[PDB]
From Swiss-Prot, chain C:
Residues 324-328 are annotated as: HRRAR loop. The lineage of its organism: Eukaryota, Metazoa, Chordata, Craniata, Vertebrata. Belongs to the BIRC6 family. The BIR domain is essential for its anti-apoptotic function and is important for binding to DIABLO/SMAC and caspases. This is Dual E2 ubiquitin-conjugating enzyme/E3 ubiquitin-protein ligase BIRC6. It is found in: Golgi apparatus, trans-Golgi network membrane; Endosome; Cytoplasm, Cytoskeleton, Spindle pole; Cytoplasm, Cytoskeleton, Microtubule organizing center, Centrosome. The gene is BIRC6. Expressed in brain cancer cells. Anti-apoptotic protein known as inhibitor of apoptosis (IAP) which can regulate cell death by controlling caspases and by acting as an E3 ubiquitin-protein ligase. Unlike most IAPs, does not contain a RING domain and it is not a RING-type E3 ligase. Instead acts as a dual E2/E3 enzyme that combines ubiquitin conjugating (E2) and ubiquitin ligase (E3) activities in a single polypeptide. Ubiquitination is mediated by a non-canonical E1 ubiquitin activating enzyme UBA6. It comes from Homo sapiens. Homodimer; antiparallel. Interacts with RNF41. Interacts with DIABLO/SMAC, likely with higher affinity to SMAC dimer than SMAC monomer; this interaction blocks the substrate-binding site and inhibits the caspase inhibition activity of BIRC6. Interacts with KIF23/MKLP1, USP8/UBPY, BIRC5/survivin, MAP2K1/MEK1, RAB8A/RAB8, RAB11A/RAB11, PLK1, EXOC3/SEC6 and EXOC4/SEC8. Ubiquitinated; mediated by RNF41 E3 ligase and leads to proteasomal degradation, impairing inhibition of apoptosis. Deubiquitinated by USP8/UBPY. Autoubiquitinated; mediated by E1 ubiquitin activating enzyme UBA6.
From Swiss-Prot, chain D:
The chain holds residues 118 to 217 of 239 of the full protein. The gene is DIABLO. It comes from Homo sapiens (Human). The lineage of its organism: Eukaryota, Metazoa, Chordata, Craniata, Vertebrata. This is Diablo IAP-binding mitochondrial protein, cleaved form.
Length: 125, 263, 700, 100, 73
């Protein structure tokens, strides 16, 4: 039970994205940011025809920035479990969502997902 | 302070699940290869010496080679991705005193079919005219892949790699082959022949040598006998004719004859 | 370098030889010649034949195919026909699926792309399908191993329809085609050929059941006959048109229902809507427009460089203005070393852009310096080149235009130019990189069926509304599918994605009027909870539909509710009760001094309820309508209207409800005067309430 | 090239600012020379056209006039550019002799 | 360019597959084996970009049986 306030979510995400871009020229509590990151990545896997790729781009960017911003960098294992990781990769490569040249969320969404994954992996190493 | 586990075990598990999923048409080859290449180079280029972060199982490589073998037709981008992936997997070390990954690739009969398909077929032909070549980038990728295969197998047994190379040349040069029909990318074949001339063939089987010599000799005899009756060369080109003794498909024929002289 | 053709003389000689063969064998036994021709076509079209790998002269093969069409195939065998049909079908499916990702055309080329529909190697493939169309129509008879011809006749269509491989390949190939908007603003392309093949198969099928079986097998499976939770068969505009034309008759629709097609398409729409993500712009792409062909050039903003240290600075190539037409010197020149064959220009862009086309203009004064071939490498991150395809032959071209059928996200491109055939220098005037950015002015430029899931909804609408006689049992079969109503509502309250809103309203109305429970469910989802029923986020395959706020109102929803309420049929009293219950719940929640929509109803919804009550009381009803409007409801509405500012429209909607209730009951109006305090210090609230509530003649 | 480091720091900063300002002013002044190349291009094209047209019409005096016109403008522009490139060649020779 | 050579001047016979001459400033077709010719027919393909075909000169180099123009210099 619950309602997703999508307009509020979009406003807050873009505000947070601008702030995180500006700070990348205090710290972030990892023990608290872990829950935010988990909820964000769960939101990414819960998109459908009622959601748009425009919000997905900023969600991916904010997720990468938060994962790379906490002083102990968040690892991809701490973010998702095996089914969630398999679903996340299936968006990029799976034939359930990608049909011929028709990408899942478009070329921009595919590029954003790849950049998010690469940034999170680079943060760990 | 707190100790966090690395993400590489579960990510390796996920990729192995994906690669084993190729044969049943659930995932796309090109997208999967791009994703693996991007995620395996985080510790910036396609350097052939980089060790992949992700590690694939032996069954994953076998399934990848199989799906390549029966794959209907590949675009050039797909072939470049395949060559880069194979080059990286050569550096990859199997873990599930085992045989080298390069050894598994060379001993796999499907690698012959993959290389023959790359060097014989082309991109599917639409109305738009495309050069019967492969471009410098794919040629360099193939050369790097072959160089990695030679480097990894030199310390254990170069004979198997040399026999592989000779079998590839024999299959290309045989009846209805790419060399006989002049179909595949000329530059790629020329560079493959160039890479062959610096090998050793130290402990190769003699039946393979005999078959290669027979095929090359028959091909060159056909090429000399059945040359065209019309010559139309540009002003810049000054290359001597094939039947001209004691002075770019000729470079391919000459390279083959330079190989027979070695054998 | 010889042309991969044979010239006119050899082609004409071969055609004359075939003509002589046909002439000499016509008077005795043309069937042998038909066998010979079909065997030759089958051998050429096999897995290693010339057609599949493009080996031989194209003109000779095209001429041979043209000659084959005029033949008879009078008593040609059946095994040969089947082999030819399956080989051609597989070859054409391969050609459609593996089409190249770079489309370069000369300026004089005005042809239509092969994959496009409803309008030289395409001509060869197109002629092959014309042969298959003739082969299908052949009536076989007798023992059914020969197409004998000079109790109902049987056609080869029956044999090929029973073949699952051929039908699957044909359906997939037609599903990979596309033409939606400019279809209506014959056969010109291979997609038109496939459409003609399927139309001929439909016409020549003995029974609709065996024609519909391959279609239903295609729908029931995913990509390449795959089964899965979210797997759905690929759909496209021409395939959709063909399916609609198949179901154009009453008997075909009844057969389609009897094989469970409607439930199949409902489940397919639900799953496909769950799987995909909308690509149309949204709130995020408006917040970014504020806070600041038609495709835009990005070459001027980039920086060009070359890997040859002796190359001249090439920054002149990126300007938007080309030089003089007959300038004695090209804008940029490269001097080729005797051993060097390739020179590379690497354009770097400040940020990643969605590259679509590359334009290269040689030196028009001297085409001898035009590069022989051009190879394009594209990097998403700017460090790892990847060629798009084989080098594009550009000799003798006044203007090189390289088009990507699938736009790539590019941050840097690399054009490796080959040495010209005759000259030793390169002459280029301008280089353009056209594309769009993620956001901003350049983001906007200037088929939806394949991208979106609206294709299934069009099938459902056609099934429900093609014939009014079939409508009831269509609806009865379609209704019990889970999450169908929520999916339809979500598709309705979305940007235009292929089908106009009025058609969706018809589906929602018709499927909701066939029962009381479905009507109540539709009212609930339109008014208070638009989320998917039984949707736990833990399950990654169940539909969610989380992206819409509850209680959103548009003209379509208002029309749907008016149709639900005003219509006269058994159970309409339940719908009226549900509407009044929702109004009462919203009024009770408004006394907060919970579910969204109850927190604030749309004023248009309340006004629609008021109009429903008004026009239901004006007309005759089969139920005690005045008995529904309880006095306590009037108390609630009056209290809500008073405890609310006069300016805002929600109070005016509540006042409209009050006016409707007063219209039904004058004694309610009398109670209103009794409550307000007239039977002073009348505020604007009292004034507005008495103003709007007093419009009926009894109230006056 | 020749007088860096011999003088003191204040004159070092002075000559550096002189280099910057004089480079800017030289670019501004040399903005006129870019049009000279294009006007000589159009003059050469027009002269070649005049030669061809006078050969076509057959006017011997006009053909000689146009041929000598293209030759003379070529000689004049190539001779001012030849003085410039003689100075440039002298600079390059002084560089290669100063380096070695 | 497709070249057809007729010995008797009535029956043409193409010499080989058409030669790709796009982007060439001078087309020079040399016969590996000299042919006795009395009439030469040239098939010229349509240009890739332009719709018009422009030629400057055509030369048929050869030798005669006897007299002058029968021995190389």
């Amino acid at each position: 039970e619950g309602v997703l306030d999508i307009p509020m979510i979009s406003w807050v995400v873009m505000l947070v994205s601008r702030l995180l871009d500006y700070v990348a020229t205090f710290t972030l509590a990892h023990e608290r940011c872990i829950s935010v990151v988990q909820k964000l990545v769960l939101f990414l896997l819960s998109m459908d025809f009622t959601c748009h790729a425009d919000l997905l781009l900023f969600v991916c960017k904010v997720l990468a920035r938060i994962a790379n911003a906490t002083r102990p960098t968040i690892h991809l294992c701490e973010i998702v479990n095996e089914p969630q990781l398999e679903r996340l990769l299936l968006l990029l490569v799976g034939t359930d969502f990608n049909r011929g040249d028709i990408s899942w969320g478009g070329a921009w969404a595919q590029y954003s997902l790849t950049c998010m994954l690469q940034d999170i992996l680079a943060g760990e190493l | 302070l707190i100790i966090q586990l690395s993400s590489v075990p579960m990510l390796n598990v996920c990729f192995n699940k994906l690669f084993s999923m190729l044969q049943v048409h659930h995932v796309q080859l090109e997208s999967l290869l791009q994703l693996w290449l991007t995620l395996s180079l985080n510790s910036f280029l396609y350097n052939a010496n980089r060790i992949p972060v992700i590690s694939l199982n032996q069954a994953s490589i076998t399934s990848f080679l199989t799906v390549l073998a029966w794959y209907p037709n590949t675009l050039l981008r797909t072939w470049c991705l395949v060559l880069h992936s194979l080059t990286l997997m050569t550096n990859m070390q199997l873990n599930s005193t085992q045989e080298s990954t390069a050894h598994l690739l060379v001993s796999d009969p499907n690698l012959i079919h993959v290389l023959v398909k790359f060097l014989s077929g082309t991109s599917p032909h639409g109305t738009n005219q495309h050069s019967p070549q492969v471009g410098p980038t794919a040629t360099q990728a193939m050369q790097e892949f072959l160089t990695r295969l030679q480097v990894h197998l030199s310390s254990t047994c170069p004979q198997i790699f040399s026999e592989f190379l000779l079998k590839l040349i024999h299959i290309l040069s045989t009846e209805r082959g790419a060399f006989q029909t002049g179909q595949g990318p000329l530059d790629a074949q020329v560079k493959l022949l160039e890479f062959t001339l610096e090998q050793n063939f130290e402990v190769v089987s003699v039946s393979t040598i005999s078959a290669v010599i027979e095929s090359v000799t028959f091909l060159v005899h056909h090429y000399i006998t059945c040359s065209d009756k019309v010559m139309s060369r540009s002003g810049s080109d000054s290359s001597v004719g094939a039947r001209a003794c004691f002075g770019t498909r000729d470079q391919l024929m000459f390279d083959l004859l330079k190989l027979v002289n070695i054998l | 370098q010889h042309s991969p053709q044979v010239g006119p003389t050899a082609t004409q000689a071969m055609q004359e030889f075939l003509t002589r063969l046909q002439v000499h064998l016509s008077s005795t036994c043309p069937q042998i010649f038909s066998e010979f021709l079909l065997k030759l076509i089958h051998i050429l079209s096999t897995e290693r034949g010339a057609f599949q790998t493009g080996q031989g002269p194209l003109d000779a093969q095209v001429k041979l195919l043209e000659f084959t069409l005029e033949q008879n195939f009078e008593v040609v065998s059946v095994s040969t026909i089947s082999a030819v049909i399956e080989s051609v079908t597989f070859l054409v499916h391969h050609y459609i699926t593996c089409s190249d990702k770079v489309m370069s055309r000369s300026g004089s080329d005005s042809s239509v792309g092969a994959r496009a529909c409803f309008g030289t190697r395409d001509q060869l493939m197109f002629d092959l399908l014309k042969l298959v169309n003739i082969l299908v129509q052949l009536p076989l008879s007798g023992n059914r191993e020969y197409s004998a011809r000079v109790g109902s006749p049987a056609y080869v269509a029956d044999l090929v329809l029973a073949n699952q491989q051929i039908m699957s390949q044909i359906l997939s190939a037609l599903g990979l085609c596309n033409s939606s908007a400019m279809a209506m603003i014959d056969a010109i392309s291979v997609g038109d050929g496939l459409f003609t093949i399927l139309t001929t198969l439909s016409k020549k099928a003995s029974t609709v059941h065996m024609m519909l079986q391959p279609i239903l097998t295609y729908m029931a499976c995913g990509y390449m006959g795959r089964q899965g939770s979210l797997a759905t068969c690929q759909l496209s505009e021409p395939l959709l048109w063909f399916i609609l034309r198949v179901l154009d008759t009453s008997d075909a629709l009844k057969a389609f229902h009897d094989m469970g097609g409607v439930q199949l398409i409902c489940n397919n729409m639900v799953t496909s809507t769950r799987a995909i993500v909308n690509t149309a712009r949204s709130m995020v792409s408006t917040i970014m427009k504020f806070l600041d062909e038609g495709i835009h050039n990005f070459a001027p903003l980039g920086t060009i460089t070359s890997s040859s240290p002796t190359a001249q600075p090439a920054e002149v190539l990126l300007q938007a203005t080309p030089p003089h037409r007959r300038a004695r010197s090209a804008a940029w020149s490269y001097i080729f070393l005797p051993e060097e064959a390739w020179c590379d220009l690497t354009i770097h862009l400040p940020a990643a852009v969605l590259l679509k086309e590359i334009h290269i203009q040689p030196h028009l004064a001297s085409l001898a310096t035009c590069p022989s071939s051009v190879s394009v490498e594209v990097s998403a991150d700017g460090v790892n080149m990847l060629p798009l395809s084989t080098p594009v032959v550009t000799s003798g071209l006044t203007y090189i235009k390289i088009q990507l059928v699938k736009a790539e996200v590019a941050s840097a491109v690399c054009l490796r130019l080959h040495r010209p055939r005759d000259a030793s220098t390169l002459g280029l005037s301008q280089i353009k990189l056209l594309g769009l950015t993620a956001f901003g002015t350049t983001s906007s430029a200037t088929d939806q069926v394949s991208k979106t899931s609206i294709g299934w909804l069009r099938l459902l609408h056609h099934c429900l509304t093609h014939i009014s006689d079939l409508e009831g049992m269509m609806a009865s079969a379609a209704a019990p599918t889970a999450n169908l109503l929520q999916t339809c509502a979500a598709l309705l309250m979305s940007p235009y994605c292929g089908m106009h809103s009025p058609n969706i309203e018809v589906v929602l109305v018709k499927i909701g009027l066939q029962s009381t429970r479905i009507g109540l469910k539709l009212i609930d989802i339109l008014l208070r909870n638009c989320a998917a029923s039984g949707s736990d986020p833990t399950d990654l395959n169940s539909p969610l539909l989380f992206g819409r706020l509850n209680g959103l109102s548009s003209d379509s929803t208002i029309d749907i509710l008016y149709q639900l309420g005003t219509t006269q049929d058994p159970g309409t009293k339940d719908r009226i009760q549900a509407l009044l219950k929702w109004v009462s719940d919203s009024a009770r929640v408004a006394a907060m001094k919970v579910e969204y929509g109850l927190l604030m109803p749309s004023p248009s919804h309340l006004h629609c309820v008021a109009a429903i009550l008004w026009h239901s009381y004006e007309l005759l009803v089969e139920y005690d309508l005045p008995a529904l409007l309880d006095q306590e409801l009037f108390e609630l509405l009056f209290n809500w209207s008073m405890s609310l500012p006069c300016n805002m429209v929600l109070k005016k909607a509540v006042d409209s409800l009050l006016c409707s209730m007063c219209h039904v009951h004058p004694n309610y109006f009398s109670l209103l005067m009794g409550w307000m305090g007239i039977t002073l210090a009348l505020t604007e609230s009292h004034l507005a309430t008495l103003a709007s509530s007093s419009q009926s003649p009894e109230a006056i | 090239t020749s007088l860096l480091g011999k003088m003191n720091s204040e004159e070092e900063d002075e000559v550096w600012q002189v280099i910057i300002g004089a480079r800017a002013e030289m670019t501004s002044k040399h903005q006129e020379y870019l049009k000279l190349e294009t006007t000589w291009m159009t003059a050469v094209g027009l002269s070649e056209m005049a030669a061809e047209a006078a050969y076509q019409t057959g006017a011997d005096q006009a053909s000689i006039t146009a041929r000598n016109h293209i030759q003379l403008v070529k000689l004049q522009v190539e001779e001012v550019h030849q003085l410039s490139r003689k100075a440039e060649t002298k600079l390059a020779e002084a560089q290669i002799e100063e380096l070695r």
